[PDB]
């Protein structure tokens, strides 16, 4: 991080509303921790996916006031979702799970405060 972490109204919303809804969802389980490509038998995962990202990592970052700005957290979420769409076959079950979470993410983000302020 070039910037210190802090708390903004948008980051607090991403934590207390958006992550709260996503973490507990029944389709969250493939996304709660980093992909372990050896354990899962995915030998080219790290050749294909340049920036792994997962909700466990995002949740820890939110808990530890890691982020400087909400866009940084948003970028992490969209990287996680994109990695799934890129790596997986369109017919893989995990793609449906990611799509379901994306819809929830978008629905919650639609009610986030739209001007960012430090707390």
């Amino acid at each position: 991080s070039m910037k210190p972490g802090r708390v903004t109204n948008q980051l607090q919303y991403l934590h207390k509303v958006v992550m709260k809804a996503l973490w507990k969802h029944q389709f969250a389980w493939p996304f709660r921790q980093p992909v372990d490509a050896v354990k899962l038998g995915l030998p080219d995962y790290h050749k294909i996916i340049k920036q792994p990202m997962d909700m466990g990592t995002i949740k820890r970052r939110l808990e530890n006031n890691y982020y400087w700005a909400a866009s940084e957290c948003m970028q992490d979420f969209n990287t996680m979702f994109t990695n799934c769409h890129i790596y997986n076959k369109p017919t893989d079950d995990i793609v449906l799970m990611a799509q379901t979470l994306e819809k929830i993410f978008l629905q919650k983000v639609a009610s986030m405060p739209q001007e960012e302020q430090e707390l």
Side-chain angles (χ1 to χ4, degrees), residues 33-37 45-55 57-58 61 75-76 79-81 83-84:
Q33 61 288 307
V35 175
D36 186 337
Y45 187 79
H46 293 291
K47 298 180 200 197
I48 295 160
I49 296 303
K50 281 67 165 72
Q51 181 55 72
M53 188 48 57
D54 68 283
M55 294 205 307
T57 298
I58 298 170
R61 284 177 173 191
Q75 180 179 335
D76 288 347
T79 300
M80 177 185 80
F81 295 131
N83 289 346
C84 180

Side-chain angles (χ1 to χ4, degrees), residues 14 19 22 30-31 33-35 45-46 48-58 61 66-67 70-88 94 98-99 101-102 105-106:
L14 284 156
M19 183 59 83
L22 293 170
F31 304 102
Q33 61 288 307
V35 175
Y45 187 79
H46 293 291
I48 295 160
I49 296 303
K50 281 67 165 72
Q51 181 55 72
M53 188 48 57
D54 68 283
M55 294 205 307
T57 298
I58 298 170
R61 284 177 173 191
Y66 165 94
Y67 295 112
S71 64
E72 199 181 355
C73 181
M74 307 282 233
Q75 180 179 335
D76 288 347
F77 277 109
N78 286 129
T79 300
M80 177 185 80
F81 295 131
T82 295
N83 289 346
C84 180
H85 287 291
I86 289 175
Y87 179 76
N88 290 283
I94 193 177
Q99 290 170 326
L101 302 171
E102 286 175 304
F105 175 74
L106 290 170

Side-chain angles (χ1 to χ4, degrees), residues 94-111:
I94 193 177
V95 171
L96 179 56
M97 298 169 79
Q99 290 170 326
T100 303
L101 302 171
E102 286 175 304
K103 175 168 190 192
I104 298 168
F105 175 74
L106 290 170
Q107 284 174 337
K108 304 296 181 201
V109 166
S111 292

